[PDB]
């Protein structure tokens, strides 16, 4: 598996607006919220749990990076994998996506897989 | 062994001016480069290999304190142990020293083993 | 091995302009795009994987050092050992080089293994 | 479990006012007291112990966030769980509820469980 | 053991002024020098060796927090335990106390155990 497979989606030119940490199924979980940084779009929620999916070896590196982009409020390209989490009380509250990467987008072009 | 032994030298009122990280023999390290307060004396490179010396346990604690002082750029005092790592080309690049301690220096007097 | 072998390379007066954290083969990776400090040259990319190459024991030391040299945006020297990772999609998307150290350029010249 | 069930409880629009880390029974712990940003209501105190509760694994994640939201001063929706501790004197000084989560409340909505 | 025991002492309105990360007997340590925020009293030192005393597990948590209050410069109330360290040249250098906790301080009262 790879962050930039053809099966992964990505939303370029996004800014992280709202963070949230907790714990589910005895595993910690963070979560971020993104809105378009250039006028309008659709807000997308996506976040990963520490011991659930195949992206678990990256929870520590992504949480340190998602808190780095939430801190400066810059434009980023987020790679996600839709329809990962299945907990209804939590899927309907946050999302069903799973964060799998965090690129850094320049003025008009981003830096990462496409 | 102690950071404030008699076999260890120290230089007061130094300023961490350059931070170089890397890896030699499957072990990370970092060789800071510190200059004096008013640009006097000579620069003092002091490496710290992760798993090669007897000062290995404090490699992580000395890295975070040598980065916090390289960023804020304030007075420090480093303790080293000379004549280590007989490797020829390594010493010619940085030094024959090993970072052993890092004390925070005030305006008049520092805070550590004199 | 060592960062400053005779089989390595070095790009003084570069700037870490972007940063992408992800994961490949259950192993978090991070890449950095280095543009020249005066906008000239070509974008030089050099990734780093946590448990793939022989430079794996220094992943967390290079991830935290790039993420700090990317914030300050200052000039550095990136050491690369080319022809390491052979994943074709990874190569044409990011690079074929390999981050094996990160020095700190100065007003006169860079400190580190030439 | 999760930080957003009816068996839990929260106090929205709050702001982390104080933070205390120590050690109880060979285990670290941290606690926060939450007061509004307009001079209203009664402060709400939460706690979390490293290995003496069911909120043990997320101790390091919550400490990273409770120390981040404490520095940004933004309005935080802070969740708790009532009557989880048992030490009689420990409750008489800080609290009896747990610290389970830390959202990022906005002026209109609240990105968190409710 | 606890942080708010009557056996353990406490000093209020303490501003952390110095910091020193070294290594003794194959274990790192750190010592802080807290000073009154008014100019009265005496500066008290409270070291914390990695694995030597009963306050061993909270070395990492009290080192991250001692660096926070030392940077922001906010007044806190520290709690210590006297007559702990016994190495001759170590006690004569900093102190014989052991840092057990770190409570934040408001304008009127402190958020600590009394």
């Amino acid at each position: 598996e790879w962050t930039g497979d053809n099966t992964n989606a990505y939303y370029s030119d996004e800014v992280i607006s709202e963070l949230h940490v907790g714990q589910i199924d005895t595993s910690p979980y963070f979560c971020i919220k993104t809105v378009k940084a250039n006028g309008s779009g659709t807000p997308v929620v996506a976040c990963a749990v520490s011991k659930q999916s195949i992206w678990a070896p990256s929870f520590k590196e992504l949480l340190d990076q998602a808190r780095y982009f939430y801190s400066t409020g810059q434009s980023v390209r987020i790679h996600v994998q839709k329809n990962i989490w299945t907990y209804p009380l939590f899927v309907n509250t946050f999302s069903a996506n799973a964060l799998v990467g965090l690129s850094s987008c320049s003025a008009t072009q981003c830096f990462g897989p496409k | 062994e102690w950071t404030g032994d008699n076999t260890n030298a120290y230089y007061s009122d130094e300023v961490i001016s350059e931070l170089h990280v890397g890896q030699i023999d499957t072990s990370p390290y970092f060789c800071i480069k510190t200059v004096k307060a008013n640009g006097s004396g000579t620069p003092v490179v002091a490496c710290a290999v992760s798993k090669q010396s007897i000062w290995a346990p404090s490699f992580k604690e000395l890295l975070d304190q040598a980065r916090y002082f390289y960023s804020t750029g304030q007075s420090v005092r480093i303790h080293v142990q000379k004549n280590i790592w007989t490797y020829p080309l390594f010493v010619n690049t940085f030094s024959a020293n090993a970072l052993v301690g890092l004390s925070s220096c005030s305006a008049t007097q520092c805070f550590g083993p004199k | 091995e060592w960062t400053g072998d005779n089989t390595n390379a070095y790009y003084s007066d570069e700037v870490i302009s972007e940063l992408h954290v992800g994961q490949i083969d259950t192993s978090p990776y991070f890449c950095i795009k280095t543009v020249k400090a005066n906008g000239s040259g070509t974008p030089v990319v050099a990734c780093a994987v946590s448990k793939q190459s022989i430079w794996a024991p220094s992943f967390k030391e290079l991830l935290d050092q790039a993420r700090y040299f990317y914030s300050t945006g200052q000039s550095v020297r990136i050491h690369v050992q080319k022809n390491i990772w052979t994943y074709p999609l990874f190569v044409n998307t990011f690079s074929a080089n390999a981050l094996v150290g990160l020095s700190s350029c100065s007003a006169t010249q860079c400190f580190g293994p030439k | 479990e999760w930080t957003g069930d009816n068996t839990n409880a929260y106090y929205s629009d709050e702001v982390i006012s104080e933070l205390h880390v120590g050690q109880i029974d060979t285990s670290p712990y941290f606690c926060i007291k939450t007061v509004k940003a307009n001079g209203s209501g009664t402060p709400v105190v939460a706690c979390a112990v490293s290995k003496q509760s069911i909120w043990a694994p997320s101790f390091k994640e919550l400490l990273d966030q409770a120390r981040y939201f404490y520095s940004t001063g933004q309005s935080v929706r802070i969740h708790v769980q009532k009557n989880i501790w048992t030490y009689p004197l420990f409750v008489n000084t800080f609290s009896a509820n747990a610290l389970v989560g830390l959202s990022s409340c906005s002026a209109t909505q609240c990105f968190g469980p409710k | 053991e606890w942080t708010g025991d009557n056996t353990n002492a406490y000093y209020s309105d303490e501003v952390i002024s110095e910091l020193h990360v070294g290594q003794i007997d194959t274990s790192p340590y750190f010592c802080i020098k807290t000073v009154k925020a008014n100019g009265s009293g005496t500066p008290v030192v409270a070291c914390a060796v990695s694995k030597q005393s009963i306050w061993a597990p909270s070395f990492k948590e009290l080192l991250d927090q001692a660096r926070y209050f030392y940077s922001t410069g906010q007044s806190v109330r520290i709690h210590v335990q006297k007559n702990i360290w016994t190495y001759p040249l170590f006690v004569n250098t900093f102190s014989a106390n052991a840092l057990v906790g770190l409570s934040s301080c408001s304008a009127t009262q402190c958020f600590g155990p009394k």
Binding site: D64, Y68, T72 | - | - | D64, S71 | D64
Partner: peptide
């Protein structure tokens, strides 16, 4: 001129 807020949160964190 770089934003000091991420650079400050970088050295204080962890």
């Amino acid at each position: 001129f770089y934003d000091a807020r991420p650079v400050i949160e970088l050295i204080l964190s962890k």
